[PDB]
Homo-oligomer: A and B are copies of this chain.
Amino acid sequence: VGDQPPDIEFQIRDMLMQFVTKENCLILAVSPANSDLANSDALKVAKE
């Protein structure tokens, strides 16, 4: 949305990897109640 490049999803996922892949990094998977839990990108990243 906006002027973001076509690979916004990939450059945000690669953004999150360099911060959460390191050990001793508590990962708060924040998910909204309104959306279904199976759609939690937080939980997808956490299980990855």
Contacts and interface: CB of A to CB of B under 8 A. Distances in A.
Complex copy number for this chain: 3
Contacts of A1: 37-38
Interface string A1-40: 1000000000000000000000000000000101101110
Nearest to A43: B1
Contacts of A37: 1
Nearest to A4: B38
B38 A35 contact: no
Contacts of A39: 41
Given A1-B37, A34-B35, 6 more contacts: A1-B38, A32-B34, A32-B35, A34-B34, A35-B35, A39-B41
